[PDB]
Copies of this chain bind each other. A is one copy, B any other.
């Protein structure tokens, strides 16, 4: 019993964190096999940030300009290349702590653990979701760039995010491990704003099923809804549209609890209309949207 926001154990990722320095700039790198991945903006001088020409800035650099530190050991950079917004620093030592890994690009609504790092040293681990507006509501200070987001499936680490910048609203933007930004963001100091964020509907429904699995049924009602009527209502509360894919994905949780997806949708519509009335669901006074259907099954079953 119980339902917590749970991160993956970070050990496999901790043994990959290194410090990358270029000039006055220091940030984090991810050391996998003989390559260190880090944000390409490590080569920028802040005066470059408004309109940096990364290709022009990178061509002027040599391997010895990049200082990579893994613990108290300095690694030797033997090559460098840029892939989208990530810098790939070839090093002369393969990381003996390299876990079984994959680079995965996630969709909005997906969750992952973030190992926040400063100077190549892990400071903390927390759980995040890729917002529908492609930002993440993280906890990052200056020096956290290059910290990564991941999931662990069996003993394989799926790296899905690398931190690049903080937007003016306090939300965070980054890329997958191939350097492709999530969202319409660029690694430039130009005027950029996150789009209007919306609630991850499928995740709220998954969390309502988690509440039912844990014995909370107060919010259930005798109603059902069509998918279209649900979407017309949910859109008015800035909730993401619920698709047939989401309905299918919720099937296992519907079967386990005996509450049809459209029946749970009717409960959600009522919660949006009434609020909670001084009550809580799984210890929360707000509807939680950073638990996916997969997270609910994993945490409530194994």
Contacts and interface: CB of A to CB of B under 8 A. Distances in A.
A69 interface: no
Interface residues of A, number: 47
Given A1-B166, A302-B144, A6 B286 contact: no
A185 interface: no
Q: Is the interface of A mostly helix, strand, loop or mixed?
A: loop
Nearest to A140: B2
B122 A9 contact: yes
A128 B1 CA distance: 14
B4 A128 contact: yes
Given A126-B5, A126-B6, A170 B11 contact: no
Nearest to A285: B285
Interface of A: 1-12, 14-15, 115-116, 118, 122-128, 137-141, 143-144, 166, 170-172, 214-215, 280, 283-286, 298-302
21 contacts: A1-B139, A1-B141, A2-B137, A2-B170, A3-B139, A4-B124, A4-B128, A6-B116, A6-B124, A6-B125, A8-B125, A9-B10, A9-B115, A10-B10, A11-B11, A11-B122, A124-B299, A143-B302, A170-B215, A284-B284, A284-B286
